Amino acid sequence: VKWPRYIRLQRQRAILYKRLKVPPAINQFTQVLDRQTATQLLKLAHKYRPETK
Amino acid sequence: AKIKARDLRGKKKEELLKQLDDLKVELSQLRVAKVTGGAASKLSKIRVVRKSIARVLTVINQTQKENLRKFYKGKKYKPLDLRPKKTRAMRRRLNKHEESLKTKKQQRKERLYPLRKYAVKA
């Protein structure tokens, strides 16, 4: 498909982060908490939510 | 008879339109007389009938505009002809309310340090 410009631009922005040498201070955010610890963290964080309006 | 603007204002719109449509028949009858060639008394009545029609239509339009501005009196959005027509730059100004706000800093500054009235001996 001949995709629109914004779709093509974001898709080959996603490829440039795989091509170019990402410095470690930006690369450290790709290293992420795994699937089971995040649910425990949000389960704990649901008990300390700020009040609504 | 002399059609006056003072006694047309209490009348209803339909009996005003009846007089308007009668005076338009009068103009058509006078303009036939003008092109056939008629009396000067018939020729000079054209200006009389035309201004009477202008009077009746002025009363009708003024009454309709007054009822429209009575209907839209308390509404936030009103038609642009009923909105006030000043100059364009003067319609794009700030309000009394908007020019009369001052900040909490200037409010406490005016409170704490007011302009004193004083005099100096000679």
Binding site: - | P84, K85, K86, T87, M90
Partner: protein, 86 residues
């Protein structure tokens, strides 16, 4: 040949009446006016012709809104009020 004989072939016109300025300067083939420049949004005027500016200025025509503006200015642009009736 170049003069009197050549003047007999003038039978099709270059300019017509412009629909914005009313002058016969609308070039039919360039589709633009040599007096006001009608397809341009701004009217054409220049400071190298002061005489051409004073033929089309705000005092030249009818002033059918500005002369009522000048009269309404003297009363602060009062609106929606009537004089007190008899």
């Amino acid at each position: 040949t170049k003069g009197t004989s050549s003047f007999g072939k003038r039978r099709n016109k270059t300019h017509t009446l412009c629909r914005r300025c009313g002058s016969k300067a609308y070039h039919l083939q360039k589709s633009t006016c040599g007096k006001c420049g009608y397809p341009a949004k701004r009217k054409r005027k220049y400071n190298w012709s002061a005489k051409a500016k004073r033929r089309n200025t705000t005092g030249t025509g009818r002033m059918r809104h500005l002369k009522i503006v000048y009269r309404r200015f003297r009363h602060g642009f009062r609106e929606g009020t009537t004089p007190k009736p008899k």
